[PDB]
């Protein structure tokens, strides 16, 4: 699934 706004660069 696509990341939530702001969380797209979280490592896992």
């Amino acid at each position, epitope marked *: 699934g696509v*990341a*939530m706004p*702001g969380a797209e660069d979280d*490592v896992v």
Partner: antibody
Amino acid sequence: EVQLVESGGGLVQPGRSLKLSCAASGFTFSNYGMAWVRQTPTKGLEWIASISAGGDKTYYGDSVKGRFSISRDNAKTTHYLQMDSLRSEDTATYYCAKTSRVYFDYWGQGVMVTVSS
Amino acid sequence: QFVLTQPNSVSTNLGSTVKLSCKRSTGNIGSNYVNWYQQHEGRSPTTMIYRDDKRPDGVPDRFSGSIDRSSNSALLTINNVQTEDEADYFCHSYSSGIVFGGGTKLTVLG
């Protein structure tokens, strides 16, 4: 052991500013985004803002029309919410919350902000 | 960009199964993950379910999540409900913005 420790709340007059801090530790601070979420009994949980793992991308929610801005200091491993032009309706418990791509994996302890003359 | 509607409250009985719903107003519930948070009186939220149906280790296996597409709703099911499960439960999803349901207060008699 993930720890998110908030400070800086209390009572503030309308039209004045306040800056909340969220001191993080117990995980690699720079590998994860962070968000601020507020709570009231009548409006529930409202997302205010998020900032990305590298501190370079920010996202604001429509519940506050840009009066609050989010920042971080990765060397102090601390996140901040700068709350300007405060209004009575901003009274709430403010949480910071760590993200893990698709959900909020840990929440701070919350701090109360009361906007009142 | 959408709202998530939760009942205000459910009252159930020790040992029962209870289902807490979270209905998405527009767009498919299945189009992004739904998560569930438990919040006790006076305390911070903690994760019950994330990524629709995954359970953090440490959360009792009587909690489970599912997605019901026919009612466009996510469901938190608690089997063998216990009085320590009294809490407010919030669902969470997202698309272009981040959305919380309004929270359901669970009361356990018996």
